[PDB]
Amino acid sequence: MTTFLIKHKASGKFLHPYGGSSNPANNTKLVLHSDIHERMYFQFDVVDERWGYIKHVASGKIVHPYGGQANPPNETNMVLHQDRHDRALFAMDFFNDNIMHKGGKYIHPKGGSPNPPNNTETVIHGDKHAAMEFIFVSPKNKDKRVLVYA
């Protein structure tokens, strides 16, 4: 199914598991990093119309708010975990360019910087601004948007 990079729009860095492993342990944090390789490729498993799991290709683990809450508060870390459940549902809003968790909050770089350094953690946060925007691009062309829903 269609593979993509999650690119932070303001800085051009990508979502990675911290340490870049092909098999990250449960609860490894998701960070921003400039490197491109097969261990930062993602896919999107549609569950219910806009909602689905954001899946790390190399390991098959998916994105979760740490602790798996329905309504994680601001600053909750994004991590990878093997479990599938409704608290790991996100919508990939490719029109407003953001990623929304089921509870209504978004993925941010921690600190909200438009230029986070390599290995900055990502967190849940309710705010909307230029620095929490993400676009979904081809592994072979980091400037070409791809359709994550098909």
Is 35 marked within a binding site? yes
Per the CB < 8 A criterion, the answer to whether 148 and 94 are in contact is yes
Delimit the domains of the chain by residue range: 1-150
The full length of the chain comes to 150
At what resolution in Å was this solved?
2.1
Of 1.20.1730.10, 2.80.10.50, 3.40.50.300, 2.60.40.10, which CATH number belongs to 1-150? 2.80.10.50
Per the CB < 8 A criterion, the answer to whether 120 and 111 are in contact is yes
The three-class DSSP label of residue 109 is strand
The three-class DSSP label of residue 31 is strand
Is 133 marked within a binding site? no
CB atoms closer than 10 angstroms to residue 70: 12
Is 20 marked within a binding site? no
The three-class DSSP label of residue 30 is strand
* Rounded alpha-carbon distances, angstroms, from residue 11 to 15, 17, 40, 111, 131: 11, 18, 16, 14, 8
Is 84 marked within a binding site? yes
Is 85 marked within a binding site? yes
Is 37 marked within a binding site? yes
Burial of 65: CB neighbours in 10 Å, binned 0-12, 13-18, 19+: buried
Task: Return left, alpha or beta for 14; rule: phi > 0 is left, psi -120 to 50 is alpha, else beta.
Answer: beta
Per the CB < 8 A criterion, the answer to whether 114 and 75 are in contact is no
Is 19 marked within a binding site? yes
Is 101 marked within a binding site? no
The three-class DSSP label of residue 126 is coil
Q: How was this structure determined?
A: X-ray
Is 54 marked within a binding site? no
Query: DSSP labels for 36-92?
Result: -SGGG-EEEEEEETTEEEEEETTT--EEEETT--SS--TTPBEEEES---GGG-EEE
Q: Which residue has the tokens 């509870």?
A: 103
Is 75 marked within a binding site? yes
